[PDB]
Symmetry: C3
Subunit: 251 residues, 3 copies
């Protein structure tokens, strides 16, 4: 297996499928510049092969993805880079299926939201704790707000509560909870692979049109907001309190 993203095509998978595996154990599969570039190239390699009709986005280790790896300039570019990665997944001719069995935090939510189908197993957990450190889930709203129920987005954005796979299915964050992740993915890949390349591309595009319109309207405004919050006084205190394990001064 390669690092930081491994590619396995039809000759290794035994089907009309490419598997892209996140494999960066040193930082719990964080969204570094190198990992992001390697995901763009992997998606391109899959689309270029006429034998591929579907992609699986998988991971090694106990965490699926825990988020990001003057200060204003670096923060605004990090946000734009997250939007461009999500947009590449949404624009693809190929259906993309997430295979989750581990923790999901921060920017990781944006990957889960961008996939067409998502399945999670019994080790999985989810929490939106942005407000507790002085910020907000701005950029990831591009794929979360079209898919979560209204009442669930408002609850979990404001409470920061941790929840499981069953709750994630109920609210629209994932497609299905499964005790046997491998068996569920194998069945979904079999059924999607029955579709023609033209039929799958056109059927996907019907479901993504409204999502791409939201990116056109809101991506730049949300990137600027993300950066303003990152360099603020309350964000500095929030992160400092976390690293020292004390409570923040507003409490």
């Amino acid at each position: 297996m390669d690092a930081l993203v491994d590619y396995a095509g039809p000759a290794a998978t035994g089907g009309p499928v490419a598997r892209l595996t996140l494999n960066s154990p040193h930082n719990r599969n964080a969204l570094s510049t190198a990992l992001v570039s390697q995901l763009h190239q992997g998606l391109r390699d899959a689309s270029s092969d006429p034998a591929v009709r579907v992609v699986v986005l998988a991971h090694t280790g106990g965490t699926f993805c825990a988020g990001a790896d003057s200060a204003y300039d670096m923060a605004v570019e990090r946000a734009r880079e997250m939007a461009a990665l999500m947009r590449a997944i949404v624009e693809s001719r190929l259906p993309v299926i997430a295979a989750i069995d581990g923790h999901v935090r921060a920017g990781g939510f944006g990957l889960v939201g961008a996939c067409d189908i998502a399945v999670a197993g019994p080790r999985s957990s989810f929490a939106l704790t942005e407000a507790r450190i002085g910020v907000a889930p701005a950029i990831i709203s591009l794929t979360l707000l079209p898919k979560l129920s209204a009442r669930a987005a408002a609850r979990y954005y404001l409470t920061g509560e941790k929840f499981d796979a069953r709750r994630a299915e109920e609210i629209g964050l994932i497609t299905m909870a499964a005790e046997d992740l491998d068996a569920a993915i194998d069945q979904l890949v079999t059924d999607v692979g029955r579709g023609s390349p033209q039929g799958l591309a056109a059927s996907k595009a019907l479901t993504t049109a409204a999502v791409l319109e939201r990116f056109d309207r809101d991506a730049e405004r949300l990137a600027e907001e993300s950066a303003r919050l990152f360099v603020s006084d309350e964000a500095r205190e929030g992160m400092l309190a976390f690293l020292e394990k004390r409570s923040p001064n507003w409490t």
Copy 2:
């Protein structure tokens, strides 16, 4: 009972209700030119009678509706005709309730989506197999995408899986699953009939405004897409493989 659509008014139903029954057994209640014209006239006859406050859309046989009955010109007009029928149901002063106890495929989904309320019994089944024959659910998206959960539309458009009445209720395709269809319809008709003609028309229009805006933006573009897919190379192979019972060449 008349063919291809039967009309029963208040003097036969014993209430402030008209029943329109699909009755074309030779082709499993397919959407022929004649059946479509007779549904338009039935909806007009119901609205014209001041004693009618609600319509039930019912069927004979084991199938509710299984879809459609140079080649480009015929295909584009078939798609526009489907949009106009759905739009007539959505624009009516009258609440329209579907009574389903049988199979639903292709264009049949568009009728179910257009109704204000829908109930399905224990013989019912649903499957979106468009991609498996080289096409997409384009025109029917006008009423499916405003009502299905986001995760469910993406799953079932891409997998082609068959599902039951209970699953259809969970995802927003129908209002309720019922073991006794006749008892559930009788109760719903009693409760809707308590409303005044003006109150029911204004209450319905609040819920249909966003749907009619989508028709204004997207109906023509979707009709042109439907026709392009119908006359394509992959669509020809898809239908030929089905009729011979062999697998299509992309597998």
Copy 3:
């Protein structure tokens, strides 16, 4: 406790929370001019105090709120006043949580819809009987249509059926049903209060942007519709039939 709205701040609540209690027992907590003015002032007093990070909207008695307390001019202004109260809740820097254990009717639905989070206990009931008296749920659509499932809005607007807390959670009208209301509110207030003032305000605004756009487009048109229906012939007969306990003449 004060009438018609009581205010309790951090020194009385023992936390970073203000409680606003509806306390107008003579008319079952109806939306009078005085009660509405006192709610605006209470929301302002909470936002002005830097120690407050969340608001609870509570009630005395067995009813949460049962709705409204020449004729055209009075009706159009009543509708605009309802929209402005809902908009004040939606625009606030503070998360607002409803605590319901009683009946909800008419304009009361608009308060429940405007809150960010809503919890209801075992005495609660809900019914949209507008069509039965010749009118429609026009103004309250501003907060109900963004949060209810499509199939549920269409069903309950047209049937007038009564339903409970469990059903209200299923359809998106509330966040959660609870047997012990006080215990559930205490836990939610604890978790929200962990967030910073800036983080909570920015996280809320992401979820309210689409709602405020709907107010901009539709509030005035909906206020004019409300007033036209109020002074109509069918509305006069509907209310007269109710007060005499007879059936209306359209049945």
